[PDB]
Design a protein around this ligand. Structure first.
Ligand SMILES: *OP(=O)(O)OC[C@H]1O[C@@H](n2cnc3c(N)ncnc32)[C@H](O)[C@@H]1O
Ligand SMILES: [Mg+2]
Length: 71
DNA sequence: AAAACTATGCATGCTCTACTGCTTCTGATCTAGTCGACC
């Protein structure tokens, strides 16, 4: 039931298959752990007209986009 | 004076050791292409 969630945090099939061996027994809490790769949060295209509606009519942060690798 | 034994030179074959030329193997180099991973 909770395997995609664990893989989004560990990115290691071995841990997913070992920890989640019994379907009945789940994982109490799954979160980013040290020395375990986590799938980075990505960004979606924006239509400038509705930008405010996308920010729930509140303040937002503007930053520059950098041309390089993600680490 | 005549005959028998021996010495030395030379021809002859076979065997062994350098030098030139052809063929093949290795090393080194360059050029073209593939793959990982990102975006
Ligand atoms: O087009 P895309 O989906 O790759 O864009 C997202 C990527 O953009 C890079 N990036 C650069 N600067 C930022 C900031 N400030 N925040 C988030 N992402 C940023 C990342 O590499 C990202 O995956
Ligand atoms: Mg980028």
């Amino acid at each position: 039931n909770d395997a995609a969630e664990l893989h989004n945090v560990t990115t290691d099939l071995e841990k997913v298959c070992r920890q989640l061996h019994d379907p009945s027994v789940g994982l109490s809490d799954i979160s980013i752990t040290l020395f375990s790769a986590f799938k980075p949060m990505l960004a979606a295209i924006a239509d400038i007209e509705h930008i405010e509606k996308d920010m729930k009519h509140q303040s937002f942060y503007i930053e520059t986009k950098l041309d390089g690798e993600r680490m």
